[PDB]
Ligand SMILES: Cc1cc2nc3c(=O)[nH]c(=O)nc-3n(C[C@H](O)[C@H](O)[C@H](O)CO)c2cc1C
Ligand SMILES: Cc1cc2nc3c(=O)[nH]c(=O)nc-3n(C[C@H](O)[C@H](O)[C@H](O)CO)c2cc1C
C-alpha cells in the first residue's frame with residue numbers, strides 16, 4: 001500500500017512526552033518509509049492534553065483537507081476516577097468526530113495503569129511501537145476513502 | 147427465508163485472523179447454502195482493526211447499496227484498559243452507523259477474555275460458529291427492510 | 293385509562309422464547325382486557341435478537357404510524373463481556389429511537405444473570421409478569437402523546 | 439432570587455410514591471415560598487416509571503413553553519443489572535433533552551442501593567429533602583436563561 | 585503564548601466552594617499574569633451544581649462570543665451511585681457542548697473519592713493547583729481556534 005498523494009494529520013497531546021515522541025516518530029517513519037507518504041504532506045499539531053484531542057482534530061478538519069488523521073495521547077490511571085471518565089469521553093469523542101466528518105480518525109490513545117505500560121507500547125524496553133501500526137492504518141483508511 | 151436478490155456487505159478486521167476466518171466463512175456459507183444468497187452479491191472488505199469497523203462500514207454504505215451489513219472483529223482483554231474503552235466505542239458506533247443510515251448492521255464483534263473464548267465461538271474446539279447466526283440475521287433483516 | 297383508537301407496535305427478539313412469549317402475552321392481554329385496545333390495532337414483528345431491536349423498531353416506525361411501541365428481549369450474562377456491551381448499546385439505542393422519532397418506546401428488555409431471573413419476571417415460578425406493566429405504560433404514553 | 443413570571447414543569451415517575459411525593463412537595467413548596475413562583479405557573483405531569491422521564495419531558499416541552507423543568511424519579515438497585523443500565527440511559531437522556539431543546543432540565547433522579555437511602559434524601563428519618571434544592575436550581579436556571 | 589485579545593468564559597458550580605475558589609483563582613491568575621489575558625475579557629458565571637455545567641455553558645455561548653470556556657466543578661463519591669452516573673453524564677455533556685459549538689471547552693471537573701483529594705488538586709496541603717493548567721489550556725486552545 002502506497003499513498004504518495006495522501007495528506008495526513010497528526011494531533012498529539014503533550015503530557016507524557018517521553019512516550020508520545022516515540023509514538024509520533026514511529027507513525028511518521030512508517031508512513032514515509034513504507035507507504036511512500038511525502039513528508040510535506042504530513043501536518044503535526046499539538047494540544048495541551050488528551051481532553052483537547054477531539055476538538056483539536058475537529059478544528060483542523062474544518063480548516064484544511066486530510067485523507068486521514070491520527071489522534072495520539074496517553075492517559076495513566078491516577079488516584080481519582082478522573083482516568084476512567086476522561087478515557088471514556090475522549091475515545092467516544094474521537095469516534096464521533098470521525099463519523100461526523102467522514103474523515104478516518106485512527107485511535108492512538110493509550111489508556112494504561114502506569115508509565116511502564118505506555119513506554120512498552122511506544123517501542124521501548126523490548127516493546128513494539130504501536131505508532132507504526134497507526135501509521136499504516138491511517139494510510140490504508142485514507143486510500144479506501146478514495 | 148430466501149434472499150436471492152439481497153446484496154450483503156461484510157467488513158472484517160484483520161487482528162486474530164485465526165478466529166476471524168472461520169467467522170466470515172460461516173457467515174458466507176450459511177447465506178449461500180441456507181438462504182440462497184448469490185456469491186456475487188456478497189462484498190467482503192477489510193480494515194486493520196476493530197476500531198476502523200464503524201468507519202469502514204460507513205464509507206462502503208456511501209459508495210454502493212446493500213440490504214444488510216455484518217461487522218466482524220474480535221477484541222481480547224489485555225493488560226491495559228484499552229479493551230474496555232474500544233469495545234464500548236466500537237459497539238456504540240456500529241449501532242450508530244446502522245440507525246443513521248437505515249441499513250441493518252449485524253454485530254459480529256467478539257469481546258472476549260482470551261483467545262480460547264474467541265475460537266470457541268468461531269466453531270472450533272467443540273464450539274458453535276456464531277458467523278452462521280450472523281449470516282441468517284443479515285438475510286432476515288435485509289428482507290424485513292424491503 | 294382506555295385507548296380504543298390507539299395503534300401499538302411490539303417488536304420482540306427470538307432468543308429465549310420461553311421467557312419472551314409470556315412477556316408478549318401479558319402485554320397484549322393487559323392492553324386488550326384493561327385498556328380496551330383493539331386486537332387489530334396491535335402489530336407484532338420480531339427480529340433475530342436484542343441487537344436488532346433498535347433498528348427493527350426504527351424501520352417499522354418509518355413504515356406505519358403507531359402511538360407507542362414496546363421493545364421486548366432478554367439478555368443473559370454469559371462467559372464473555374458480550375452481555376455488558378450489548379446491554380448498554382441496546383438500551384441506549386431504544387432510548388435514542390424514541391427521542392429521535394417522538395414516538396414513545398417502552399423498554400421491555402430484561403438484562404439478567406440467569407434464565408431463572410428472566411422466567412421469574414415473565415410471571416412464572418411465583419413471579420410477576422412485567423409484560424403487563426409494559427402494556428399499561430404503552431397505553432398511557434400513547435394517550436399523553438395526543 | 440425571585441421568579442414571579444417563571445413557568446416551570448415537573449414530570450415525575452410513579453414507582454416509590456413514598457419517596458417521590460416528599461420530593462415533589464419540597465420542590466413546589468420551595469419555589470412558591472422562597473422564590474415567589476406562582477402555583478398556577480407550575481405544571482405537574484407524571485409517567486409510569488423513570489424510563490419514560492426523558493420522553494415525557496420531551497413531549498411536554500413540545501406542547502407548552504417552560505423556563506425550566508425538573509425530572510423526578512427514584513431507581514433502586516435490584517437483583518439484576520437492570521438498575522445499572524436504566525440509570526445510565528435515563529441520566530444521559532435527560533441531559534440530552536435539555537441540551538437539544540435549550541430548556542434547563544434539573545436532575546431529580548435518585549439512584550440508590552435501598553429504599554432507606556431514598557427516603558433519607560426525601561427529607562425523612564433525619565435527612566435533607568433534595569426536592570428543595572432542585573426547586574431552587576430550577577428557578578435559578580430559568581432566570582439565567584432569560 | 586499571549587492572548588491579549590482573547591475573551592474567555594468560566595462557569596463554575598457552587599458545591600464545595602472551598603475547593604472551587606482556589607481552582608477559579610488559579611485559572612484567572614495564570615491567564616492574566618502568564619498569557620496577558622485582560623481581566624475585563626474574562627466572564628465568570630456560576631450554577632448551583634455540576635449537573636448544570638453543560639447547560640450553563642451552552643446558554644452563555646449562545647449569548648456572547650468567547651474563544652474558550654472552562655467548566656469547573658467538583659464531584660465527590662457518596663453513599664449512592666449518584667456520583668458515578670452524574671460524573672459520566674456531565675463529562676460527556678461538556679465534550680458535546682464543545683464539539684457542537686466549535687468553541688473549545690476545557691474540563692475543570694474534579695471527580696474524587698473524598699474532600700482531601702479535591703483540596704490537594706486545588707493547590708492546598710502541598711498539592712498543585714490544576715486551575716493554572718486549565719487557564720493555560722484555555723488560552724492555547726483559544727489561539728489555535730483563530
Ligand atoms: C487531575 C488530572 C489528571 C490528568 N491526567 C492526564 C493524563 O494522564 N494524560 C493526559 O493527556 N492529560 C491529563 N490531564 C489533562 C486533561 O487531558 C485535560 O487536558 C484537562 O482536564 C483539560 O485541559 C489531567 C488533568 C487533570 C486535572
Ligand atoms: C494496545 C493495543 C491493543 C489492540 N488490541 C486489539 C484487539 O484485540 N483487536 C482488534 O481488532 N484490534 C486491536 N487493536 C487495534 C485497534 O482496533 C485499532 O485498529 C487501532 O487503535 C487503530 O488502528 C489494538 C491497538 C492497540 C494500540
Ligand SMILES: Cc1cc2nc3c(=O)[nH]c(=O)nc-3n(C[C@H](O)[C@H](O)[C@H](O)CO)c2cc1C
Pocket residue numbers: 252253254267276279280283305306307340341342343344365366367368370374378
Ligand atoms: C456470543 C453471543 C451471545 C448472544 N446472547 C444473546 C442473548 O442473551 N440475548 C439476545 O437476545 N441475543 C443474544 N445474541 C445475539 C445478539 O443480540 C445479536 O442479535 C447478534 O450479535 C446480531 O445478530 C448473542 C450473540 C452472540 C454472538
Ligand SMILES: Cc1cc2nc3c(=O)[nH]c(=O)nc-3n(C[C@H](O)[C@H](O)[C@H](O)CO)c2cc1C
Pocket residue numbers: 398399400413422425426429451452453486487488489490511512513514516520524
Ligand atoms: C425489573 C424492573 C425493575 C424496575 N425498577 C424500577 C425502579 O426501581 N424505578 C423506576 O422508576 N422504574 C422501574 N422500572 C420501570 C422502568 O422505569 C420503565 O418504566 C419500564 O421498563 C418501561 O415502562 C422497572 C421495570 C422493570 C421491568
Ligand SMILES: Cc1cc2nc3c(=O)[nH]c(=O)nc-3n(C[C@H](O)[C@H](O)[C@H](O)CO)c2cc1C
Pocket residue numbers: 544545546559568571572575597598599632633634635636657658659660662666670
Ligand atoms: C444526592 C446528591 C448529591 C450531589 N452531589 C453533588 C457533588 O458532589 N457535586 C456537585 O457539584 N453537585 C452535586 N449535586 C447536585 C447535582 O450536581 C445537580 O446540581 C442536581 O441534581 C441538579 O440541581 C448532588 C445532588 C444530589 C441530589
